[PDB]
Amino acid sequence: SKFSESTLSGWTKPASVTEEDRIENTISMIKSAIKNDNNFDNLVYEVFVQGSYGNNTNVRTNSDIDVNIMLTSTFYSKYPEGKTNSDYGFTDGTITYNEYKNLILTALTNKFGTGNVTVGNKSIKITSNSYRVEADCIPSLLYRNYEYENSSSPNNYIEGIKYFASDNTSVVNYPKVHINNGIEKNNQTHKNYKRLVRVIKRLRNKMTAENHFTNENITSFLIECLIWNVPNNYINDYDTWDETIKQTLIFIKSSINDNSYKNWTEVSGMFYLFHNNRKWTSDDVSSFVNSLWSFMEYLEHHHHHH
Ligand SMILES: O=c1ccn([C@@H]2O[C@H](COP(=O)(O)OP(=O)(O)OP(=O)(O)O)[C@@H](O)[C@H]2OP(=O)(O)O)c(=O)[nH]1
Ligand SMILES: [Mg+2]
């Protein structure tokens, strides 16, 4: 490639933490807001980090921490066909998503100030210089998936989250299963899976910056999911990032061309990576991989002359 091993390895590094206790303080300050609110006294909820910070795949210190405030005492369920709430002894629920979301807004407002709380389409942005909190908060209800493994045991389900965007479209995600699956792949690749995720994101950013390639449908989440689908041998068998990235591009290109990409899941295993309601298509990923191949000059320029 046009880049040195030293340069590529630098682009695999985790994002610097400018505060040693940023995640710690962020969780603390949000948990403080809820626990001091008497309207959450009878509710069971969890505050946890998801997205790039949760997966240690963020490449920019300046980026937003994704914090899920997950209600668990009320939840949504997916049942095997023909089953209903009453088959598990469950009610329709004591509190609605909208009621929960308004309680969360009151708590965060009292803690942070009406000026420092903005409701976005898929998150509540906290800009609190006072508490040093810069966070996107996702109020969600726990999603019990009983259908995936065919459980009739109320205690046996796949745990996801469900919330409604501002437009009231339904979102179901499996952030905890995502995180667990990525740690597992990182353990099987001597921590090179996440290093590879980070260098591909940085190269996407560089390609855009230097006007080589722009496609808004190539998201950070998509890149993490794509590299998660690269077989461990492509990460384990090579002694350079130069070669690891070369074989990664060849495999992804090969996998779109031979239609095996259609069986690829997101990191959670709970949805297909490519489907008609994703922002991206296989054509977007083909273009991305082709632009990266060209940008990295894996086909060396004639006479090494650009
Ligand atoms: O399970 C998921 C998780 C995410 N998404 C899509 O990716 C977008 C960004 O979500 P994040 O949790 O913030 O991902 P992250 O790794 O932090 O990337 P970054 O913040 O660095 O971009 C989601 O909004 C969603 O895409 P849209 O559906 O909103 O277009 C999943 O789809 N499922
Ligand atoms: Mg994010």
Side-chain angles (χ1 to χ4, degrees):
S1 79
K2 50 146 61 157
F3 299 116
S4 76
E5 266 318 285
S6 196
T7 299
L8 295 174
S9 163
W11 292 332
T12 74
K13 285 179 167 147
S16 288
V17 293
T18 286
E19 308 185 330
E20 174 63 356
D21 63 338
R22 200 199 154 174
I23 288 170
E24 310 251 316
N25 187 57
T26 302
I27 296 323
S28 290
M29 286 304 103
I30 290 155
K31 279 184 172 161
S32 162
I34 310 305
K35 81 169 33 161
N36 287 328
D37 192 318
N38 299 332
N39 294 340
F40 295 77
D41 286 356
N42 295 317
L43 304 184
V44 182
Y45 57 87
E46 185 188 354
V47 176
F48 69 96
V49 180
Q50 59 180 49
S52 63
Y53 279 85
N55 283 283
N56 196 36
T57 58
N58 64 304
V59 286
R60 296 185 319 95
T61 307
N62 206 236
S63 53
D64 312 315
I65 298 183
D66 295 311
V67 181
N68 200 311
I69 319 176
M70 183 185 59
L71 185 65
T72 70
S73 48
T74 305
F75 57 83
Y76 295 109
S77 291
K78 187 183 169 202
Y79 299 121
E81 194 179 19
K83 302 307 210 208
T84 71
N85 288 157
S86 53
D87 294 307
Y88 297 80
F90 299 154
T91 74
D92 198 34
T94 70
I95 183 175
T96 71
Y97 180 68
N98 194 58
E99 288 172 343
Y100 172 63
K101 191 193 203 198
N102 289 330
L103 291 186
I104 290 277
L105 279 171
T106 301
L108 295 177
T109 297
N110 285 339
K111 178 64 165 182
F112 291 122
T114 182
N116 311 318
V117 179
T118 324
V119 188
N121 189 36
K122 307 189 90 177
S123 75
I124 302 164
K125 204 141 182 310
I126 303 178
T127 37
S128 152
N129 220 352
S130 271
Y131 291 109
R132 313 180 285 119
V133 177
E134 294 276 320
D136 294 24
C137 304
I138 307 101
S140 75
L141 262 70
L142 187 138
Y143 190 81
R144 296 187 185 201
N145 187 336
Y146 290 101
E147 191 278 333
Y148 185 74
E149 289 190 349
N150 195 197
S151 165
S152 191
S153 298
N155 248 53
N156 180 26
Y157 53 78
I158 308 296
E159 185 188 312
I161 66 132
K162 173 170 153 151
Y163 64 96
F164 293 92
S166 68
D167 56 19
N168 285 287
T169 55
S170 199
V171 176
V172 179
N173 293 339
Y174 291 90
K176 285 195 192 163
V177 188
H178 184 126
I179 286 162
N180 290 333
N181 282 356
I183 291 166
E184 173 186 47
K185 195 184 174 72
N186 218 36
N187 289 347
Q188 295 160 350
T189 55
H190 314 278
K191 301 175 199 310
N192 284 339
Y193 153 57
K194 288 190 176 173
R195 293 181 183 128
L196 180 56
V197 170
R198 294 197 298 256
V199 61
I200 301 297
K201 286 197 221 202
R202 283 190 177 119
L203 286 164
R204 177 217 41 205
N205 293 354
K206 199 178 174 67
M207 277 201 311
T208 301
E210 301 185 2
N211 306 293
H212 175 86
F213 182 75
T214 302
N215 186 321
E216 287 305 306
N217 304 324
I218 308 306
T219 71
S220 294
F221 171 77
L222 170 64
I223 286 170
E224 188 165 332
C225 287
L226 286 170
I227 301 307
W228 183 77
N229 277 285
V230 175
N232 292 354
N233 52 288
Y234 294 109
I235 302 167
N236 281 336
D237 293 358
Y238 299 103
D239 292 305
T240 68
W241 290 109
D242 187 80
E243 195 50 38
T244 301
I245 294 167
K246 176 167 179 164
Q247 298 294 327
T248 292
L249 296 185
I250 292 159
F251 169 75
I252 300 173
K253 192 196 182 169
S254 188
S255 299
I256 301 157
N257 288 345
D258 75 3
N259 296 126
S260 67
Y261 78 88
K262 292 175 167 168
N263 294 327
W264 288 10
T265 70
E266 58 173 58
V267 183
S268 75
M270 298 304 293
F271 295 112
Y272 291 102
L273 181 53
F274 298 87
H275 69 66
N276 67 35
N277 289 317
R278 298 292 201 186
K279 207 213 310 203
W280 51 84
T281 63
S282 50
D283 287 340
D284 292 319
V285 172
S286 251
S287 299
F288 179 56
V289 162
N290 286 336
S291 309
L292 202 32
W293 180 267
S294 83
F295 184 64
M296 307 220 57
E297 297 183 4
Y298 277 123
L299 184 70
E300 191 172 75
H301 278 252
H302 183 78
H303 279 14
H304 193 246
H305 290 357
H306 179 73

